[PDB]
DNA sequence: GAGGATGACGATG
DNA sequence: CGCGCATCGTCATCCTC
DNA sequence: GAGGATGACGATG
């Protein structure tokens, strides 16, 4: 009664979202007060997903699987006009005043009996628990396997009228989903390495050309509308940035041209303009990345009746090798560093031959520093420093996660001043910064030098960084996630489902140049039979005409035949036999023809003569051209970043060798 | 005219074509006319009679086409009436 | 890096010209100097002075105000009030003809026809004003208008508490009403003359519609020498009137109506 | 105080007012003007008929 | 009973 | 992603010595 | 000299 309320209502959308406001909210309050949840202190409310109406009747729908059910059991499909409930400005007063009309239905509370709901209330929120929360995400994975494989729906909440709601379900049906939904946009798959976020956003661009320009703002709402995007619009923009960036120490190859200021590799790399302020352009590199021709390839999913984008791609090259994968999930986390781009191709080319690839090493684009490997999935990073005079000395050269402002005000702040334990270790510094490169006009006591020398420079100045990569977990192309040991096996599994799709792409592609060799065919035989002349075209009835066509061994629309052999793989079509204008009848046309029925005949006994093998290659070819193109566009690049400056001089420079603490 | 058959279509040069439709008294596009005449208001252009498909040669066609045409002259002889 | 000049006191009457509650009528002459100035030169097709031609020390006040205030005083006039042939600003000038561009059989997100809006009609003032535009075009409430251009979905506003409570621009839903087809006839494209900015085709200066909107959604236009306030009006009267001058005979006098309105 | 007691049950459009009054105090107001002593009145003046030509 | 003071306002910064 | 100060000018109330 | 405490982080609320 002191208290100066006495219930307390929580309401959130039907997403996964609340469910974590609501955890952390029970995790408040127990974490101080565990005797409150027993005295019907917390109630919820809830709100509709869906709703169907049609001749003025309305049903309620609260779940997902409640939906799939309605579906299951009743015989009326697109017969009720279905309206969804994404967000709250959907709903209106008039819907508010039902929602308030019935207070048994939605505003429920919960119930508490045994201590033991409190360790699952711990599960989802020990730091001593990530092993039983990785056998419980485990759990809930392999039923969800069986329970697809056997076709069984699966268990929903909220189906009748409740008055409590127990713990133990709220934690193991409701949170769960929430975690589940996290960890598949959180971390991106093995096959393709693109998160959800960064798959809509190249899908919308693949549906346009854009051989212009186009802003980023007004991109973000193309993007959602057609890819059923329900996060707002600052994440949107916020990943259109991160795939935008391509500075040293972000990536290596993107799929968008620098158009403005995207953030300098001073401060932080976030110091970007308004999404608005700044525009952006499609590169050339996704043509042959991605090629058209396997839209055919992957099954793309049906919801809103629309199709959408697939669940994965199939790129050429290993996008987390190039990019780097950063997830952060639960139960799990990735983060794999950059390679090298051009080594990618060889080791391809070796494994092709069937020999044992090299090892490789992590490489960064416009990066001179030295990386040597002591214990396996460990890296040690250091930079270059010259030693001008006895007294002057320049960083030519800093290591990766190193910004100008934090490197700064971490590290000459302390050296320049005699702090509360530490001489002052520099006397003067410089910073001559360039857009990339960094200058250091740097002096320091010749007797101290030699201290420094001995204690070690690299050491001083704090230039070392130590990385391990041991998460290597990544969606596999059924779904489950194992932990990975090297890149090597990564590469021989990209390779093996690769393999699979050879064949594929060969028996889509043949029969498919045959369709159009013999629809040619039969539009030249057609001709020939009108230079003979005996088909009338004085006003003969059209049944006549299909009557002839069908005597004449003339078969239908072989197109007609791919398209209906797609969705599951009157009479006959003649439309195509009568659209054709009169120029067929000159004799240039004719006799363009006449080769170009031929031009298509090559490529198909090619094809029918070639080997499903030999051909990454010379798609490959391809692809290093361009590429060889992309470095000459990015060496004239670097050519008008040349201010006319003289050249860094020659100084002495060592790598400190540090003492391997024999570390896991 | 193709009914009547003068026209060979047996190969024949672009040119010979060109020739006999300025010889039988065959304008050029006139929507081409109009889109000159908007600015400020080769040599001869007959895609239009060849852009045609064998649509065109049915018995349907010919009927409806023989009444389309008279549906523009009904509203242009309301036009010339109308004030 | 210029610096200023001032040279006698007359400078600090024309520093309180634009800036003096009780010189409303001296400003008027002055923008009527300008406007018969800019006809004049524009009819001879002699060039007009600029400033900044070549490198300059000092900046002179009168020139300062006499030549690059008044184009802001221009511009403000020229966008804030509507003409009397259509009645249309700018702004819903710009975003009519973006919404003409396309068919728009479905509906559209407000946040996202803004930027087709921006893209095309070479819109330069942010995109906060542009929204707000289109919140202005979309409200139908009764007080508010009597004809709009679009469909209402979602909450635009009510009647309650001022009518700016609406939620977000993307929150909300819009769609093309069917009524601009027959107030536009697409035959009236071949009328006017577009505009040439960027060697793009960009909307006309004006339209011709069936009514003057300004007598059936009102112009409430706030400038620099003049302003605009016309109330509203009744829709089924326009047409018996214009009948009546068609026919050539005295119009009867009009009375501001409004609709769902029973108030004497 | 004028008023003794109101109510507001507003419509989307329309709206309500239980409004109650001592009937002394009526006549008064009736004497003065119900449009005044509410202010109901609205006065508005069009002078201001400037457009671009 | 009249004049200075207070908001109504609509596109833009 | 909601939060907030103003401009140009015209006018309806409105209140006190 | 080792273990708890402090930030690095990337998509979303």
């Given at each position: ?8 209502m ?13 955890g ?7 974490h ?15 709100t ?53 009309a ?17 360790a ?10 990530i092993?039983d ?7 809930f ?17 909220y ?26 946009r ?21 549906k ?37 960036q391509?500075?040293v120490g ?9 158009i403005g ?13 308004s999404?608005?302020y ?21 099954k ?39 390679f ?10 070796r ?25 396996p999935?460990?890296?040690?990073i ?10 002057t ?25 005699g ?14 910064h ?18 420094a ?21 990544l ?9 990975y ?10 390779f093996?489902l ?65 398209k ?5 793989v ?36 090619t ?11 010379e ?14 566009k990015?060496?004239?690049?670097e ?26």
């Amino acid at each position: 009664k002191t208290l100066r309320y006495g219930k307390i209502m929580i309401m959130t959308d039907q997403d996964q979202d609340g469910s974590h406001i609501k955890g952390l909210l029970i995790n408040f309050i127990h974490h101080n007060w565990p005797s409150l949840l027993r005295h019907r202190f917390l109630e919820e409310f809830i709100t509709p997903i869906v709703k169907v109406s049609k001749n003025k009747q309305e049903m309620a729908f609260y779940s997902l699987p409640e939906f799939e059910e309605w579906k299951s059991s009743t015989p009326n499909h697109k017969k009720w006009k279905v309206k969804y409930y994404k967000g709250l400005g959907t709903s209106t007063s008039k819907e508010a005043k039902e929602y308030f009309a019935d207070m048994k239905r939605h505003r429920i509370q919960f119930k508490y009996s045994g201590p033991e709901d409190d360790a699952a209330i711990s599960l989802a929120f020990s730091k001593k628990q990530i092993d039983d929360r990785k056998e419980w995400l485990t759990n809930f994975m392999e039923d969800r396997r069986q329970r697809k494989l056997l076709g069984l729906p699966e268990d929903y909440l909220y189906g009748q009228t409740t008055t409590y709601l127990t713990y133990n379900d709220f934690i193991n049906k409701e949170l769960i989903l929430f975690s589940n939904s996290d960890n598949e946009r959180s971390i991106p798959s093995m096959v393709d390495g693109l998160k959800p976020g960064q798959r809509k956003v190249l899908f919308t661009c693949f549906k346009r050309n854009d051989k212009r320009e186009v802003k980023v703002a007004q991109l973000a709402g193309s993007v959602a509308e057609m890819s059923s995007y329900h996060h707002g619009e600052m994440s949107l923009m916020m990943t259109i940035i991160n795939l935008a960036q391509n500075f040293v120490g972000s990536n290596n190859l993107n799929l968008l041209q620098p158009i403005g200021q995207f953030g300098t590799r001073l401060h932080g790399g976030k110091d970007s303009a308004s999404p608005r302020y700044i525009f952006t352009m499609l590169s050339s590199l996704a043509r042959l990345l991605f090629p058209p021709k396997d839209d055919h390839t992957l099954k793309f999913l049906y919801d809103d009746n629309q199709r959408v984008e697939p669940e994965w791609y199939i790129p050429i090259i290993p996008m987390v090798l190039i990019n780097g994968a950063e997830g952060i999930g639960t139960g799990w986390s990735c983060k794999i560093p950059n390679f090298d781009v051009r080594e990618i191709v060889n080791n391809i080319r070796r494994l092709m031959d069937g020999e044992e690839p090299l090892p490789m090493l992590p490489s960064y684009k416009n990066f001179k520093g030295t990386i040597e490997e002591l214990a396996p999935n460990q890296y040690v990073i250091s930079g270059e420093v010259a030693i001008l005079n006895s007294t002057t000395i320049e960083i030519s050269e800093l290591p990766v996660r190193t910004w100008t402002q934090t490197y700064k005000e971490q590290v000459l702040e302390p050296m320049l001043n005699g702090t509360e334990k530490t001489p002052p270790l520099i006397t003067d510094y410089r910073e001559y910064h360039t857009d990339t490169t960094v200058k250091f006009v740097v002096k320091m006591t010749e007797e101290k030098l030699a201290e420094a020398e001995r204690v070690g420079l690299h050491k001083v100045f704090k230039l070392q960084t130590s990385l391990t990569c041991n998460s290597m977990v990544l969606f596999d192309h059924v779904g489950c996630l194992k932990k990975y040991d090297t890149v090597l096996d990564i590469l021989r599994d990209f390779f093996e489902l690769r393999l699979k799709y050879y064949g594929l792409r060969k028996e889509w592609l043949l029969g498919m140049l045959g369709a159009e060799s013999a629809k040619l065919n039969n539009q030249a035989r057609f001709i020939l039979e009108k230079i003979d002349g005996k088909i009338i075209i004085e006003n003969k009835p059209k049944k006549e005409l299909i009557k002839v066509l069908i005597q004449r061994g003339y078969d239908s629309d072989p197109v007609k035949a791919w398209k209906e052999a797609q969705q599951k793989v009157s009479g006959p079509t003649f439309n195509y036999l009568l659209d054709m204008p009169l120029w067929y009848l000159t004799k240039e046309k004719k006799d363009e023809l006449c080769r170009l029925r031929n031009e298509k005949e090559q490529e198909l006994d090619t094809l029918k003569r070639k080997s499903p093998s030999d051909l990454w290659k010379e798609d490959l070819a391809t692809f290093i051209e361009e590429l060889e193109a992309v470095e000459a566009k990015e060496k004239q690049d670097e050519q008008v970043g040349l201010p006319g400056k003289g050249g860094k001089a020659k100084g002495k420079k060592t790598q400190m060798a540090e003492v391997l603490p024999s570390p896991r």
